[PDB]
Amino acid sequence: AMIEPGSKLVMVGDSITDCGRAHPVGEAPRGGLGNGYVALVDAHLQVLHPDWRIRVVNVGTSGNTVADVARRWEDDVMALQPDYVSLMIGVNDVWRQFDMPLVVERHVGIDEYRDTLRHLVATTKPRVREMFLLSPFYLEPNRSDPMRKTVDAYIEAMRDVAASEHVPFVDVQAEFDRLLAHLNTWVLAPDRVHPYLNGHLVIARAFLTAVGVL
Amino acid sequence: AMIEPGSKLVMVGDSITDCGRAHPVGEAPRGGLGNGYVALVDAHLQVLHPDWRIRVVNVGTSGNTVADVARRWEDDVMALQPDYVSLMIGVNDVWRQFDMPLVVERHVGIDEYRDTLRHLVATTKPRVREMFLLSPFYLEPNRSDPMRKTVDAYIEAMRDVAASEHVPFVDVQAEFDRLLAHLNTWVLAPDRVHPYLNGHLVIARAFLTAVGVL
Ligand SMILES: [Cl-]
Ligand SMILES: [Cl-]
Incomplete structure (x- = not known):
């Protein structure tokens, strides 16, 4: 899944991708990537x-959510002329159903989520060398917890889009599941969603392994 | 030079080590380590x-400087009952001679630096499983630059103290010199002294390699 020399890799997502990056565009020099x-x-x-x-x-x-990402995709992502694009999205799409259950317009259901991911991959893949789909994750080892179960269904929807569009899928949730057998969730995040540096290192290593650097 | 399980590793130094860590003592949970x-x-x-x-x-x-570290050693470092101690120090000892050349009581000359390091290792080694001496560094590839030449002399004084006491020496400066053949110093720091995340990763990997993790 190699990244060619001299390429621009644009990484897209929610706060976990954002991490305080610079606006309008986060770049490497200094601390612009967050x-x-x-x-x-x-x-x-x-x-x-x-x-x-x-x-x-x-x-x-x-x-x-993936709806917000789709709305800004051409202007915020494709206008940068990426050679590679990564996308991690879905935790908010699910989380809003739990933290704002009555505020239904903030929710993105699984069919909208799957369809929107398919459209983003379909329009992006022809214009880039490769697109990487990074699973959303939720730091809850009990896969019968209702929100964890819902996150797993969304992860499956992403995996299915990746397979049907033939783009790489990076199973970040699986890496956390392995680590959660050794460390409890409070070591990794204050709220099961937003990791400390340790969890960010898990995500980075999973991505770098997928592109053959580690 | 492995670290035995269940051990406390106390890392000591100047702002490079500090990085906004918590007071009075920086611990891992959250971002207490900086x-x-x-x-x-x-x-x-x-x-x-x-x-x-x-x-x-x-x-x-x-x-x-190393004089500041020595003044607080027993109360800030040994009182924590470390199993392992690391120390990176020396860049300020040198830098003050260049950024405040007339303010001589801020300077620490090489004989004081060497003698203070000797004393810190001698007093610590019997009380810990291992101590690691991490080179100070200066991100200037021209070895004839006067401050870079002086930093190199202090690094070699540290190396010689480590060899005398038979404690590990981690040559962080050498890892930066290899990287500086590929990236110019402005990519790594705004001032040749305080690195961005990229340079902190160089230091971390050098330490982790020295303890057998990488
Ligand atoms: Cl494992
Ligand atoms: Cl090399």
Whole structure:
């Protein structure tokens, strides 16, 4: 799943991608990528593969569902002329159903989620070298917890789109499940959703492994 | 030079180590370790070796020379009953000679630096499983630059103290020199001294390699 030298990699998502990145566009120099997994991906590429000249860009936005991502996709993502795009999205699409159950217009149901991911992949894939779908995740080891069960269904929908569109799927949730057998969720996040540096390192390493750097 | 499971590792130094860590003592939970190499060391230990149960602690203090470290050693470092101690120090000892050349009581010359390091190792080694000396560094590839030449001399004084006491020496400066052949210093720091995340990852990986994790 190699990243060609001299390429621009645009990483898209919600707050976990955002991590305080610069506006309108987060770039590597200084701290413009924020302080989470996107900044860690860039740091590993520059420290281990500086000659690859990979330009990493962050356009994550806190609170986004896949509907928000789709609305801004051409202007915020494709206008940057990416060679590679990654997308992690879905935790908010599910979370709103639990933290705002009566505020139904904030919810994105699974059919809208799957259809919107399919459209984004279908329009993006012909214009990039590769697109990477990164699973949303929820740091709850009990897969019968209702929200965890719903997140797993959305992850499956993403996996199915990745398979049907033939783009790579990075199962970040599976990496957390392995780690949660050793560490309890409070070590990784204050709220099962937004990880500390440790969980951002899990995401970055999963992505870097998917692109053959680790 | 492995770290035995269930051990407390206290990391000491100047702002490079500090990185906004919590007072009076920086601990892992949340962001108490700051947002630099000490936090990255802890993150890798917990993600890759959670069963090791390594408690990482940060007592770095911005602006410290080795004289400042020695003054607070017993109360800030040894009182924590460390199993392992790391120390990176020296860049300020040198830098003050250049940024405040006439303010001589802020300078620490090489004989004082060497003798103070000797004393810190001598007093610590019998009380810990292992101590690690981490080179200070200066992100200037021209070895003839006067400050870079002086930093190199202090690094070699530290290396010689480590060899005399038979404690591990981690040559962080050498890892930066290799990377500086590929990336210019402005990619790594705004001032040749305080690195961005990329440089903190260089330091963390050098430490982790020295303890057998990478
Ligand atoms: Cl495992
Ligand atoms: Cl090399």
